[PDB]
Design a protein around this ligand. Structure first.
Ligand SMILES: [Mg+2]
Length: 212
RNA sequence: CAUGGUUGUCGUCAGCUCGUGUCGUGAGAUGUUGGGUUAAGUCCCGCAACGAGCGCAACCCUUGAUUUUAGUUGCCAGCAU
């Protein structure tokens, strides 16, 4: 399967090139098979306790894929910017959670109107801006028991903070990326639209098989 | 030039900070920079930061038009004197 140019590759993935071609490297699919075996097994073994599982899709080409798998799988996700402090500053992110909860309870259950225009002026624009980040994780009460990423080159903050928390992380890696930070890495290109979906399908099946 | 309290002053300038987080051996930084915009760290997009406080703004008084209430010590149109 494809990779990225020979101009900016990472030698940590010498294990994973296979039979290169015009400008772009290609990946050892059998290695990929074994890695997805370990990762699928481990995802199932993690979520067998009904844990909390977080997805990252900060990259354009996998926003939609991550979102679709996450809504099908009932486990939390992110696609817009990674708020620096998601899990380290989780206290204050959870303050923001409580705030959003208060707003959407105040609009319907408590009194909707207390000001003359402030509701549709500011409260709704703010609630848009909150959903523009918090997405799925609004109902993630505790920390994750495991994390999925799609591009540890783009998503280094999420990777780094999960590492500091010693949360187990997993994720696809293009040739530019670095697996040594990842625990149960999967070699594959992350810029194509079909493949990232094709992997998160299996990795959401892994949790759906056992959330029951 | 021991002090309180009161006061000018930079300057009604838009700035000064902080909890948690992160980077840095560390002091420190981040946030508070940037691109725009605004009278204004005002507000939006973006960002290893997310948020908050003091300030800014607004709530106050006054002036600027008008409705209802009340019409004397004010007013005088329609009226006589
Ligand atoms: Mg003021």
């Amino acid at each position: 399967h494809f990779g990225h140019q020979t101009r900016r590759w990472n030698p940590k993935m010498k294990k994973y090139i296979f039979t290169e071609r015009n400008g772009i490297y290609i990946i050892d699919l059998q290695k990929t098979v074994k890695k997805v075996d370990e990762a699928f097994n481990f995802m199932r073994e993690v979520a067998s306790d009904n844990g909390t599982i977080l997805f990252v899709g900060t990259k354009k080409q996998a926003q939609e894929s991550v979102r679709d798998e996450a809504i099908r799988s009932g486990q939390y996700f992110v696609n817009h910017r990674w708020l620096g402090g998601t899990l380290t500053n989780f206290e204050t992110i959870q303050k923001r959670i409580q705030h959003l909860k208060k707003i959407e309870r105040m609009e319907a259950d408590g009194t909707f109107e207390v000001l003359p225009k402030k509701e549709v002026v500011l409260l709704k624009k703010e609630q848009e801006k909150l959903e523009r980040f918090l997405g799925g994780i609004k109902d993630m009460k505790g920390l994750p028991d495991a994390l999925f990423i799609v591009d540890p080159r783009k998503e280094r903050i999420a990777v780094a903070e999960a590492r500091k928390l010693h949360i187990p992380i997993i994720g696809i890696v293009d040739t530019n990326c670095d697996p040594d930070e990842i625990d149960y890495v999967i070699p594959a290109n992350d810029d194509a639209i079909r493949a990232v979906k094709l992997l998160t399908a299996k990795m959401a099946d892994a949790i759906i098989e056992v959330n029951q």
